[PDB]
């Protein structure tokens, strides 16, 4: 009973919105803005005079690096990166809906390659922001549906 998706990833009432955070030039804001743009969303300033426009506000990312597993001498084998993002979607008339993303990625340590490993970490982190942005977008339909229901 498979049919091509006939609906937009982003709900119709969200096809125009305000993006807002305290780090508009940071990588999270870039990843999110980019995902919104690829989904056909028009982004406006918070100063805009168009009313009834939903606002996506991004909180600050947390990024943790934990030892996931150790070798037999107690040295880290695998590291786990965890990225967490809190956000809100304000639908101006109705209510304020919190959403979040959580991203796990891991890599193996190499003290002989430390510089290389550092670069690997940068790469991984850069990708996680993208994942986080995607997660947030995929939570939009649940917002739209939660607003209709109430």
């Amino acid at each position: 009973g498979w049919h091509l998706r006939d609906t937009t990833q982003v709900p119709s009432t969200m096809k125009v919105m305000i993006l807002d955070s305290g780090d508009p030039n940071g990588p999270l804001s870039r990843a999110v803005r980019n995902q919104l743009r690829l989904n056909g969303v028009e982004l406006l300033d918070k100063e805009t005079t168009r009313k009834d426009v939903p606002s996506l506000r991004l909180g600050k990312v947390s990024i943790a690096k934990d030892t996931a597993s150790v070798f037999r001498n107690g040295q880290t084998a695998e590291y786990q990166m965890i990225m967490t993002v809190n956000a809100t979607v304000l639908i101006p008339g109705r209510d304020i809906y919190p959403i979040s993303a959580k991203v796990f990625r891991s890599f193996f340590d190499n003290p002989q390659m430390a510089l290389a490993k550092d670069n690997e970490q940068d790469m991984i982190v850069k990708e996680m922001y993208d994942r986080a942005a995607e997660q947030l977008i995929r939570k939009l339909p649940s917002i739209r549906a939660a607003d209709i229901r109430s």
Partner: protein
């Protein structure tokens, strides 16, 4: 009921209407039995005296209002001569006598006592004073506690106590700390971190016993240095080492953002002296600096910096800014400028490697990264990346390099509701100047070249479709998606064997990783690619459109071998082309409290799973949870991705098969019990074990804890070395907002810390 509400039972009131704005011109109600005197300038009231203005309510036997000299502007003085009771939205005061200046807000109450309103704390003094427009509370011969009325648990007394509301700190002269009526500690002068906006109650001395140090104790001393800076100075006695580790922490807030420094210094060490008899000194030390901030939305500053006296430091000393699981310390500085279409960042990256096989490490000194983006050119998006870096070794006999790189990219994104495609063309151009090659080239068949150019085009095309169907059969309103995804990637072969590999490590490929266009990080090795990646994700959404489930599986099919021209990787077989690499991932939120996750990475060239992970978790709340988890990495994977000696050495070569279990349960709303166990199934040995118990009340909390962990390796007996620690800690509660039972903190305390998996 929970701890917070139980505690709020003992925190008084604040009835009466809350007034917004000032108290200045607001009406003044005055009831008494008599008023003598000339009303505006001199008034003496008496009997049953009750006065109300704004949020304040004064009540006493006799109240005297006055005005005065120093012609100026108008001088207003109030006096209260018996059974004085003052009331507002902040504090309740009581005492035999009182005084105030309504202009300056400065106040006195003699032989009085105070109790906070809306929060914990109370105390008494021979003289209570408000100064500096309610900035400063001064207690002459005073006491304070956060204990509820009727509870004598603890208090602090001093000949003089001065609390600063703005800085959130109390100075105490002749401080004595009391448990019940019995003082257990005296200090001539102390500063404590105390205020309504404080996130932690002020610290008290504590102790522990360890395999490493035997008996240890610490004396935290808070020092508020200046505005936006403070420090903590903590002598830490470690018995086995026969000296004091002086721990120093410095915290600051600046316009460039927030930071912390730590300098821990141990002047001599008996254990280290015995293990290194011929050495110049036994001193041990740590310096740590962390800074992050974004200034004016544009400048981004970062420091992550750790330097220790020697490789055994984190095996010997408490793991806070470092861990005994660390293989090296990182030293990193960066400054960067970022606006919407542009960024540039300059940085330094250095490393201090612990183990001795080679402690040699390459550094980036400095590195410059630039990105420029332009989205609008026709249907195309464009960007350019460039980098300049200078690589230097810690050894003097090793190649040094400068490397410059340019990577222009153009792509055409295209999208439907059901479908997406993206085409991308890119050029990679890199230039190396390598020097100090003489030593390297005498020891190696394959020669490094002084001048190297690597130029090569890349083509990549990506596509995705989303199919949907209803699942009524599963549950009403459930939706299922099928999302096939495919990629073709072409990069031509370039022989890179004359380029030293400074910054490039082999990347792990999980499901998302499959679609990455690089085999290595960094720029020194770029694998040839002729390949097609294919995968599919399926998702299940509930009636509320919340994704409850997903699974994904993919592979990479190689039409030709992936080559850098220097290929050192030890695989288990000769497989070149076909589907070499597979990966899969799954997530299921079963219910509100239950979830599971898993992932697997498989490579045919290993004849085995590369790595895999699994977990399942029950969580009712922050205090009640159970988690099981598993991590696997094959011996083949270790042999393929890690230096040769890891594959021959016992502490490494078996790879990872690691099961762990973590659980916490609360009791009677005041108790928290927590445990974790981590077990290597290959060796049938414990990796890590931890237990903790905490009791939390309104005015304090006590935690006993225990950990046994792998601390190192003994090269003679060829077995693991373990460390055991057991400790007590007492904290003061009611000094901040925290009503927690300390579950999360304890879950984070061990070397394999807890992470919520849903």
């Amino acid at each position: 009921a929970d701890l917070a509400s139980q505690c709020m039972l003992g925190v008084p009131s604040y009835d009466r209407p809350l007034v917004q704005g000032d108290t200045n011109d607001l009406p003044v109600t005055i009831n008494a039995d008599h008023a003598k005197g000339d009303y505006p300038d001199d008034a003496v009231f008496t009997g049953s005296v009750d006065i109300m203005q704004g949020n304040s309510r004064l009540q006493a036997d006799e109240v005297q209002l006055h005005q005065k000299e120093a012609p100026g502007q108008p001088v207003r003085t109030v006096d209260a001569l018996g059974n004085v009771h003052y009331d507002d939205n902040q504090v309740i005061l009581k005492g035999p006598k009182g005084w105030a200046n309504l202009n300056t807000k400065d106040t006195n109450v003699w032989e009085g006592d105070y109790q906070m309103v809306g929060r914990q704390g109370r105390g008494k003094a021979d003289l209570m004073k408000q100064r500096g427009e309610n900035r400063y509370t001064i207690l002459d011969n005073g006491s304070f506690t956060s204990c509820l009325p009727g509870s004598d648990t603890w208090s602090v007394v001093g000949s003089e106590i001065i609390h600063d509301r703005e800085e959130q700190v109390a100075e105490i002269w002749n401080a004595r700390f009391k448990v019940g009526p019995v003082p257990i500690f005296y200090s001539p002068y102390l500063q404590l971190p105390v205020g309504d906006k404080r996130r932690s109650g002020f610290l008290i001395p504590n102790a522990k016993y360890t395999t490493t140090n035997y008996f240890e104790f610490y004396l935290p001393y808070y020092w508020n240095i200046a505005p936006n800076m403070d420090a903590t100075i903590t002598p830490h006695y470690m018995h086995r080492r026969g000296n004091i580790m002086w721990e120093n922490e410095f915290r600051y807030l600046s316009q460039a953002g927030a930071g912390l420094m730590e300098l821990d210094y141990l002047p001599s060490d008996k254990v280290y002296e015995d293990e290194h008899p011929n050495d110049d000194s036994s001193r041990r030390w740590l310096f740590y600096w962390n800074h992050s901030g974004v200034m004016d939305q544009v400048w981004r500053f970062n420091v992550d910096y750790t330097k220790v006296s020697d490789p055994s430091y984190f095996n010997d000393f408490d793991n806070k800014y470092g861990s005994s699981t660390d293989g090296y310390a990182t030293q990193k500085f960066s400054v960067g400028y970022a606006v919407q279409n542009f960024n540039a960042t300059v940085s330094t990256k250095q490393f201090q490697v612990f183990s001795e096989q080679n402690t040699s490490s390459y550094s980036a000194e400095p590195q410059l990264d630039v990105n420029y983006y332009q989205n609008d050119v026709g249907p195309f998006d464009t960007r350019i990346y460039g980098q300049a870096v200078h690589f230097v070794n810690t050894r003097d006999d090793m190649p040094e390099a400068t490397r410059v790189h340019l990577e222009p990219t153009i792509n055409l994104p295209l999208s439907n509701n059901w479908g997406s495609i993206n085409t991308e063309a890119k050029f990679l151009a890199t230039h190396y100047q390598q020097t100090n090659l003489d030593w390297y080239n005498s020891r190696n068949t394959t020669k490094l070249d002084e001048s190297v150019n690597r130029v090569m085009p890349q083509f990549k095309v990506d596509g995705k479709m989303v199919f949907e169907r209803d699942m009524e059969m599963l549950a009403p309103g459930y939706t299922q998606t099928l999302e096939p995804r495919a990629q073709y990637l072409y990069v031509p072969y370039r022989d890179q064997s004359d380029i030293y590999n400074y910054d490039s490590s082999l990347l792990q490929s999980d499901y998302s990783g499959l679609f990455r266009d690089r085999t290595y990080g960094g720029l020194d090795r770029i694998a040839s690619a002729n390949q097609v990646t294919t995968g599919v994700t399926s998702r299940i959404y509930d009636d509320a459109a919340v994704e409850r489930f997903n699974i994904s599986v993919g592979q990479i099919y190689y039409f030709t071998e992936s080559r850098t021209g220097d290929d050192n990787i030890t695989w288990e077989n000769d497989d070149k082309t076909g589907s070499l690499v597979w990966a899969g991932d799954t997530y299921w939120r079963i219910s509100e409290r239950w979830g599971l996750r898993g992932g697997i990475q498989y490579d045919t060239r290993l004849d085995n799973v590369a790595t895999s992970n699994s977990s399942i978790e029950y969580r009712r709340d922050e205090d009640r949870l159970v988690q099981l988890n598993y991590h696997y990495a094959s011996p083949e994977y270790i042999q393929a991705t890690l230096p040769k000696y890891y594959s021959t050495a016992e502490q490494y070569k078996n790879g990872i098969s690691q099961v762990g279990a973590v659980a916490s349960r609360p009791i009677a709303d005041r108790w928290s019990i927590v445990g974790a166990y981590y077990y290597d199934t290959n060796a049938n040995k414990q990796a890590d074990s931890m237990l903790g118990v905490q009791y939390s009340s309104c005015c304090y909390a006590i935690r006993v804890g225990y950990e046994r962990k792998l601390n190192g390796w003994d090269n003679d007996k060829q077995h693991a070395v373990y460390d055991n620690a057991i400790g007590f800690n007492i904290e003061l509660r009611g000094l901040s907002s925290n009503y927690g039972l300390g579950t999360q903190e304890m879950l984070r305390s061990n070397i394999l810390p807890y992470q919520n998996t849903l």
